[PDB]
Structure 1
């Protein structure tokens, strides 16, 4: 009703509902509008609407898209968070001509920054993955921004519970595959599977039989296959072992992962050798997951 008058609509950004760029007429500014058709899934959907909209009203981080309002029209609903044109991150990185341990530490830092914020806000993302990681602009020094969805949740303090089975098979923690209560930690485990791809450009776990992929993910079976991992600082490999910890209670918190700087200090102290092969594999994986996923 109200989004009809104040706003003007322009090109689509993405689809799933449809994302589209708009600009507010009254105080001229761009945003990005989720157009959620009035056909969602009766109830299970409407519940996730208000959850996503609430969470995003709460999440205001410099590294996370912030919402503005959520308007309900007749045959549609609109959610207006912050706009971007940056391309995907795993897409920008391949375009880079110099990729080093120090660019990867610059990423996981901003990442852990969005994560920590919300973990302090009693909310867990549960779906952490390349898709969900984007670049503010293509402009230099553009920021990584976490994409708030939608299998998301509000925990009580540090209390662990069973929030049900959600997320992507590769990005799923064992505590969730074991069908045990969980919490903020299931987010840290994702980052760890993310960092590992953020170095060598292939994932730590995978199998075509998904029953098997899950077994690895429940068994913590990953290793640092030579040569590609030989040129990698043992600090890098250290963080990776701290996130990729099977027991969530022993798992490095997000607060802890920022202080230990194989990122901040290896930004200061780590390997910059441009690894062109990793970058290539990376790009390939990306295309595959786009078509396969």
Structure 2
């Protein structure tokens, strides 16, 4: 794929590659001049030539045709697909050019968090966008900062020699949601494993079945990461992850522990976890009850953390819906009408 995504390459006799936007296991997204839309810059996702990502790209195209025609103005902030084509056996999906990922913005600023005013506007828009999927019988299943993008390059950046990086300052925080390659319809077959480790709901880890609510969990994990500049689930291990959940959120409901087939993780009705091992004291140091992550006691910080706690409810049957999230007091500030 190296061989077909260089600067100056022309795709479908119109898209001149100018830059790389993002890469991953799916393939590459490249910025192109479209010489047949008056020189408009667009994004083109060149999908890896592997059955998994070919199948995923066919699924994404069908999802985007549905969401795009259901919501032609993009009121619910899903990325607009322009068309798709084939380039040397690769599916290429053309989209409207968006800005930076929320992931790159935080990361390149040295893992410095978004301002609370920005998080409020971003959480609302993320909740509206994904609630739109929920209304149309879809679960995204892979919500993470990489897949939430600023609509625009609406920031300033200045080289700071003291820390030897550019710092970016957000002017406007408007986002869209990308990557519908995993999105699953209610009636379709449900993968066992879904989501990126740090963003995975407990009902996924425990293979108890999943729906819309696994998206709500992922959004909760996104919002705390936006507030802190890093994840509270920094792990590469499901058992460790569950141990971190116990220390941050309190103990798992017995019913979920007793029902799961993933019994390697447990012993009788507790996590099979050596608290007193090296690794166990490590997790205890990295972990404290959620509300202790709060950077202020100020009521608008309390309002965010109450929404985060409801999104990170263990029982997906009890977990807040995005319909209800959109009505949470944290968003009252956006509906100020004197």
Instruction: Give TM class, smaller chain.
Output: 0.7 to 0.9
Q: Alignment partner for residue 105 of structure 1, among 108, 116, 120? A: 120
Alpha-carbon distance in structure 2 between the residues aligned to 1:226 and 1:242 = 16
Given candidates 118, 130, 143, the residue that maps to 2:145 is 130
| CA-CA distance at 1:254 after TM superposition | 0.8
Structure 1 CA distance for aligned equivalents of residues 182 and 114 of structure 2? 32
Question: Could you say which structure has the larger radius of gyration?
Answer: 2
* Residue 153 (str. 1) matches residue 184 (str. 2): yes
Q: How many residues align?
A: 260
User: Deviation string for 1:2-36 (max 9, x for gaps)?
Assistant: 95234333222222332212233333232111123
Matched, 1:56 2:64: yes
> How much does 1:228 deviate?
2.7
**Structure 1 length as normaliser, TM-score?**
0.77
For 1:256, the equivalent position in structure 2 comes to 324
C-alpha contact 1:177 1:218 (8 A) present in aligned 2? no
Match of 1:200 among 228, 237, 248: 228
Task: State the match for 2:41 in structure 1.
Answer: 30
Q: Which residue of 2 aligns with 1:80?
A: 94
Q: Is the 8 A contact 2:113 2:225 kept in 1?
A: no
Q: Is the 8 A contact 1:7 1:23 kept in 2?
A: yes
Work out whether residues 78 and 176 of structure 2, in 8 Å CA contact, stay in contact via their aligned partners in 1: yes
Cα displacement string for residues 202-244 of structure 1 (whole angstroms, at most 9, x for unaligned residues): 4333456542213444784442226735346332221112111
Q: Secondary structure at the match of 1:225?
A: helix
Aligned partner of 1:143 among 174, 179, 189? 174
Q: Structure 1 146/218 Cα, relative in aligned 2: closer, same or farther at 3 Å?
A: farther
How far apart, in 2, do the equivalents of 1:227 and 1:26 lie?
A: 51
Provide, for residues 39-98 of structure 1, a one-character-per-residue CA deviation record: whole Å limited to 9, x for no partner.
Answer: 32xx333221201111122223342211011112443321112212x2232554659x99
The aligned counterpart of 2:201 is 173
Residue 184 of structure 1: aligned partner: 212
2:301 pairs with 1:247: no
Q: Is the 8 A contact 2:20 2:28 kept in 1?
A: yes
Give SS of 2:13's match.
Answer: helix
TM-score by length of 2: 0.67
TM-aligned CA deviation for residue 106 of structure 1: 1.1
- The answer (yes or no) to whether the contact 1:197–1:204 under 8 Å persists in 2 is yes
CA distance in 2, matches of 1:107, 1:209: 29
**Is 1:19 matched up with 2:29?**
yes
Residues in 2 aligned to 1:203 and 1:167: alpha-carbon distance in whole angstroms:
15
Match of 1:68 in 2: 82
Are 1:119 and 1:184, in contact at CA under 8 Å, matched by a contact in 2?
yes
Give the Cα–Cα distance (whole angstroms) in 2 for the partners of residues 227 and 55 of structure 1.
38
Give the distance between the partners of 2:207 and 2:21, measured in 1 at CA.
36
2: CA distance between counterparts of 1:113 and 1:68? 22
Q: Counterparts of 2:100 and 2:148 in 1: how far apart (Å)?
A: 10
Could you tell me whether the CA contact under 8 Å between 1:162 and 1:180 is conserved in 2? no
Aligned counterparts of 1:198 and 1:27: Cα–Cα separation in 2 = 36
Write the distance in 2 (CA, Å) between the matches of 1:183 and 1:27.
Answer: 40
Larger RCO (alpha carbons 8 Å, 6+ apart): 1
